[PDB]
Amino acid sequence: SGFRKMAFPSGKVEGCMVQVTCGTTTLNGLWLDDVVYCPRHVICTSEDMLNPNYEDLLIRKSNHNFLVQAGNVQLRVIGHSMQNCVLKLKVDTANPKTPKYKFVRIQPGQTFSVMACYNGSPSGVYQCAMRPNFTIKGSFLNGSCGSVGFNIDYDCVSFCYMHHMELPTGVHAGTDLEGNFYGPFVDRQTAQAAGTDTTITVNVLAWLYAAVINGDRWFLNRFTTTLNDFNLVAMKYNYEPLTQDHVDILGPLSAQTGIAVLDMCASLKELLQNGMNGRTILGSALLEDEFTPFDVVRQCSGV
Amino acid sequence: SGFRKMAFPSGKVEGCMVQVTCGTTTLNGLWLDDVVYCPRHVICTSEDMLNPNYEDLLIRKSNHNFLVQAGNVQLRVIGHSMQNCVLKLKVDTANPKTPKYKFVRIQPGQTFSVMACYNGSPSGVYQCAMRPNFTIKGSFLNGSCGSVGFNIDYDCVSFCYMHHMELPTGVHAGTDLEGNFYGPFVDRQTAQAAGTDTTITVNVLAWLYAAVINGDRWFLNRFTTTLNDFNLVAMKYNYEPLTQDHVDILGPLSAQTGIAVLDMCASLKELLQNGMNGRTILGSALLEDEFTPFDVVRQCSGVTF
Ligand SMILES: *[C@@](O)(CO)[C@H](C[C@H]1CCNC1=O)NC(=O)[C@H](CC(C)C)NC(=O)c1cc2c(OC)cccc2[nH]1
Ligand SMILES: *[C@@](O)(CO)[C@H](C[C@H]1CCNC1=O)NC(=O)[C@H](CC(C)C)NC(=O)c1cc2c(OC)cccc2[nH]1
Numbered sequence: 001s002g003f004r005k006m007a008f009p010s011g012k013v014e015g016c017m018v019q020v021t022c023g024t025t026t027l028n029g030l031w032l033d034d035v036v037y038c039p040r041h042v043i044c045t046s047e048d049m050l051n052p053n054y055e056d057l058l059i060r061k062s063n064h065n066f067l068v069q070a071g072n073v074q075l076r077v078i079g080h081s082m083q084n085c086v087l088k089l090k091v092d093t094a095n096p097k098t099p100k101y102k103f104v105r106i107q108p109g110q111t112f113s114v115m116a117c118y119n120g121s122p123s124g125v126y127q128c129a130m131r132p133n134f135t136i137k138g139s140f141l142n143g144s145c146g147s148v149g150f151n152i153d154y155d156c157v158s159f160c161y162m163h164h165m166e167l168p169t170g171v172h173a174g175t176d177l178e179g180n181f182y183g184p185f186v187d188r189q190t191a192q193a194a195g196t197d198t199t200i201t202v203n204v205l206a207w208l209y210a211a212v213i214n215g216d217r218w219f220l221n222r223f224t225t226t227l228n229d230f231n232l233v234a235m236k237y238n239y240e241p242l243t244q245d246h247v248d249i250l251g252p253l254s255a256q257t258g259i260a261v262l263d264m265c266a267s268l269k270e271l272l273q274n275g276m277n278g279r280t281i282l283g284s285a286l287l288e289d290e291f292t293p294f295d296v297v298r299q300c301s302g303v
Numbered sequence: 304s305g306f307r308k309m310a311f312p313s314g315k316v317e318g319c320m321v322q323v324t325c326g327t328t329t330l331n332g333l334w335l336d337d338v339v340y341c342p343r344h345v346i347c348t349s350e351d352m353l354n355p356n357y358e359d360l361l362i363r364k365s366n367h368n369f370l371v372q373a374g375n376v377q378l379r380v381i382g383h384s385m386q387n388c389v390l391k392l393k394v395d396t397a398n399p400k401t402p403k404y405k406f407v408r409i410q411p412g413q414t415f416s417v418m419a420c421y422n423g424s425p426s427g428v429y430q431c432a433m434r435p436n437f438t439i440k441g442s443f444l445n446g447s448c449g450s451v452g453f454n455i456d457y458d459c460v461s462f463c464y465m466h467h468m469e470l471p472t473g474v475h476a477g478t479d480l481e482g483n484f485y486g487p488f489v490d491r492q493t494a495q496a497a498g499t500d501t502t503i504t505v506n507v508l509a510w511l512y513a514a515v516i517n518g519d520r521w522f523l524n525r526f527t528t529t530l531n532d533f534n535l536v537a538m539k540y541n542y543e544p545l546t547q548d549h550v551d552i553l554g555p556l557s558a559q560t561g562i563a564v565l566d567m568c569a570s571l572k573e574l575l576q577n578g579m580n581g582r583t584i585l586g587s588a589l590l591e592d593e594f595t596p597f598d599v600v601r602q603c604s605g606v607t608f
């Protein structure tokens with residue numbers, strides 16, 4: 001038993017991180033097959049990053065302008081191209097540690113493992129959720145650009161995120177592996193704001209089911225609610241609406257605990273209107289929304 | 304910026320996880336060089352685990368009773384010995400993925416990364432802190448025994464934990480890599496209860512230093528205190544007493560901020576005696592105690608490996 005923010009084992013990705021240097025700008029790259037993926041602002045200088053004409057800056061670059069280091073060996077760039085915000089450096093050597101992989105675009109509310117890296121060296125691993133406003137709440141410092149987020153199914157690594165930016169509020173933004181940003185952000189050196197940060201309701205309910213599966217039921221109550229009446233209150237608190245598909249996804253957790261989804265919604269509605277006083281749920285004083293129903297099923301099934 | 308419970312990259316440990324099976328009992332083991340370490344109760348059957356005599360049970364076992372598998376590839380066992388609650392099996396193959404490593408026994412309050420494993424396959428990684436009652440708030444299912452906890456310093460993997468037990472309260476217990484349990488627990492199929500837990504003071508202070516580094520310093524006061532005075536007061540609030548090693552590991556954060564350790568102790572004492580007064584620290588009204596000073600430095604100045 002127990003419930004914990006859990007990331008996938010990172011070994012398959014560690015063998016793909018490399019360092020990419022252009023002029024005086026260094027960040028991380030992802031070496032899969034004979035291609036190295038990294039954020040395209042590596043080609044920028046401190047002055048270019050203010051308003052970079054990336055296609056203009058790119059054509060002016062030569063293959064030898066890119067220093068790609070994989071551990072100790074230095075890889076030979078035999079080609080360069082650009083797919084949106086992701087720079088694609090073709091190398092003369094295919095990464096032998098390339099696992100089975102696929103590029104996917106995560107949906108808001110879904111989770112993934114972040115492998116934070118600096119100078120091409122993996123430094124830490126943690127779990128994140130793609131928030132409804134397409135930001136994530138990570139831990140990234142100078143030099144973390146190029147770090148990727150991923151999920152692992154069987155032996156297939158599904159890459160979904162490459163890090164680019166830290167907003168003035170302290171949350172983070174990035175792209176999928178096709179170079180398309182999550183959210184309305186742009187890779188220029190400017191202070192940018194996200195949309196309003198709504199709460200992932202289906203995850204909050206999953207996390208409440210986890211608390212019950214782990215012996216905590218102080219927030220439960222005898223009231224019930226309709227889907228619509230719950231969503232009225234939820235939206236009033238800047239919570240995403242609960243769809244019937246969300247209800248269906250919570251099915252397994254409902255059966256296991258014996259608490260109907262709409263019954264859990266009545267508890268959550270009371271928590272939102274009353275607060276938690278001084279009490280805690282699974283050790284937290286706030287309502288956690290970065291746990292998916294699948295995260296809870298994985299850890300609490302059969303407990 | 305940002306603060307998260309962050310585990311070490313697990314690749315160096317993944318290449319060392321294997322499956323050990325005796326009869327029908329299976330669990331995980333740690334393959335380093337030509338030795339596999341695992342919990343000794345793998346020799347037990349379901350009924351044996353009730354009141355086991357491990358010396359008597361082990362005498363009836365031979366090298367050929369042990370199934371050790373890397374994936375689906377068996378590693379022939381050519382030797383076996385018992386050290387405390389850890390079984391050691393010599394195999395005929397030296398793990399080519401063996402990293403630089405050492406075995407360490409950590410202290411309460413220290414943190415490590417747990418490699419959750421099932422049937423020898425790594426499944427998840429997450430950070431834990433050894434509680435002052437020698438339990439960890441883990442996430443472990445059936446078949447998780449033999450999962451190890453580790454830290455990575457440079458290129459050296461320091462193994463400090465091997466999983467054995469889930470207590471009734473849902474927390475977890477286990478040993479170091481020499482088979483010595485953390486806390487007053489024994490590997491028997493019986494409900495055991497840990498001592499009353501307490502808050503990890505040195506980590507709370509580190510958390511406060513983290514706040515000061517980030518401009519949130521409303522809680523600093525003009526008071527100071529002695530180490531003995533603070534310890535006697537902290538014990539009244541369920542806080543662990545500080546050691547000399549605790550003051551020392553707070554050294555870097557103390558120098559970086561300019562706040563002496565005993566001054567921040569006096570500030571924490573204020574927070575315990577009068578509460579938070581409706582305010583928060585780093586966004587939370589709850590004092591966090593699972594971040595060590597190293598974790599705080601690690602996330603304010605990203606170290607690599
Ligand atoms: C990459 O490492 C750079 O290669 C970096 C991410 C780091 C920075 C510290 N925290 C992180 O997560 N990304 C950046 O520095 C990006 C670069 C653009 C894509 C060109 N910009 C920002 O993070 C950025 C610019 C800001 C600004 O305007 C100057 C105001 C406020 C915040 C802000 N952040
Ligand atoms: C190992 O996986 C078994 O090899 C397992 C730990 C797992 C199982 C679910 N959660 C975990 O952390 N360990 C056990 O099952 C141990 C085995 C002993 C070392 C022999 N037992 C317990 O953890 C145990 C026995 C208990 C009991 O007695 C019947 C009452 C209450 C709790 C309890 N836990």
